[PDB]
Amino acid sequence: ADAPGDDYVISAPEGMKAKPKGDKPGALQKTVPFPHTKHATVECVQCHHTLEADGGAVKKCTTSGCHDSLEFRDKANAKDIKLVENAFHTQCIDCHKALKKDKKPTGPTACGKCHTTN
């Protein structure tokens, strides 16, 4: 397939829950701009890890049967790879952090520097 342009924004799937603020209803984080051209050095398959099984078509990470949970991350389900927060954080953050350590061009590691659209 062809990668979308750099104006692309990743947001939470509709219905996505959020940790309540004690007793007050919580809210979602800001959305995340994601520029593919800045990740040209990474093979598509590395992120779109099920590409082959999906026959060359690129499916959204949250599609049914994939990281489809709409449940917020807590202690009880902290290890569940089906969670949106785990799927994206493991992919995005780990690489950025590792590159930062090696002192080379990298992406954001701070919450506010990735969740920006607002």
Ligand code: HEC
């Ligand atoms: C990009 C390099 C990110 C960094 C750094 C952090 N987050 Fe993230 N997060 C990222 C994406 C692409 C997504 C999925 C799309 C979306 O916006 O939902 C997420 C998701 C979350 C969520 C779940 C959804 C929500 O409640 O809004 C949470 C709770 C969240 N991210 C929080 C968060 C915090 C506290 C971070 C700093 C420790 C953080 N994120 C870093 C991408 C990135």
Ligand code: HEC
């Ligand atoms: C990780 C750094 C990635 C690399 C390298 C590439 N893509 Fe990607 N792409 C990535 C994410 C996290 C997303 C959003 C997924 C979601 O569930 O929201 C995307 C999105 C796409 C899409 C559009 C999906 C949609 O909105 O329906 C396409 C078609 C796509 N990506 C194509 C693609 C190709 C061909 C790549 C190599 C040139 C490629 N991506 C690399 C993460 C990453």
Ligand code: HEC
């Ligand atoms: C459904 C066909 C999926 C698509 C599309 C994507 N992922 Fe996925 N992912 C899926 C499964 C079945 C599993 C593994 C089995 C299990 O139960 O754990 C995963 C695993 C990952 C992981 C962990 C990788 C590892 O530990 O080596 C991550 C971090 C992950 N997936 C992220 C991710 C993202 C961001 C996607 C969109 C670009 C994506 N996956 C798509 C199923 C599916």
Ligand code: HEC
């Ligand atoms: C390594 C395998 C990566 C993964 C997984 C993701 N990113 Fe990344 N990102 C990576 C590099 C090497 C760079 C720098 C590229 C360059 O040539 O300078 C980036 C950059 C970003 C940026 C731009 C930040 C800036 O300083 O302007 C953003 C906004 C970004 N990355 C977002 C992002 C998200 C949300 C990811 C998960 C879907 C993600 N990156 C994965 C390397 C890698």
